[PDB]
Structure formats: structure tokens, C-alpha cells
């Protein structure tokens, strides 16, 4: 759903607004 827009395809985000891989980036 498009609310905060989101990030690039395959990017999850934290409450702070950090984009990283849908899986574990490196440090999870």
C-alpha cells in the first residue's frame, strides 16, 4: 500500500526511515 511511498523494490524500512534489503542487510 502506498502511504509513505516506500523504498526501492526489495527494500524494507525501519521506524527511523532506514532503507535496507527485504532480508538482512548485513547487521540485520
Swiss-Prot record:
Positions bearing Glutamine amide: 25
UniProt source species: Mythimna separata
Positions of transmembrane segments: none
Effect the entry attributes to changing residue 5 to A: No effect on plasmatocyte spreading activity
Cystine residue pairs: 7-19
Outcome of substituting residue 5 to F: Significantly reduces plasmatocyte spreading activity
Name of the molecule in the record: Growth-blocking peptide, long form
Coiled coil region boundaries: none
Superkingdom in the source lineage: Eukaryota
Amino acid at each position: 500500500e502506498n502511504f509513505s511511498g516506500g523504498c526501492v523494490a526489495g527494500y524494507m524500512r525501519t521506524p527511523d526511515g532506514r532503507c535496507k534489503p527485504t532480508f538482512y542487510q548485513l547487521i540485520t
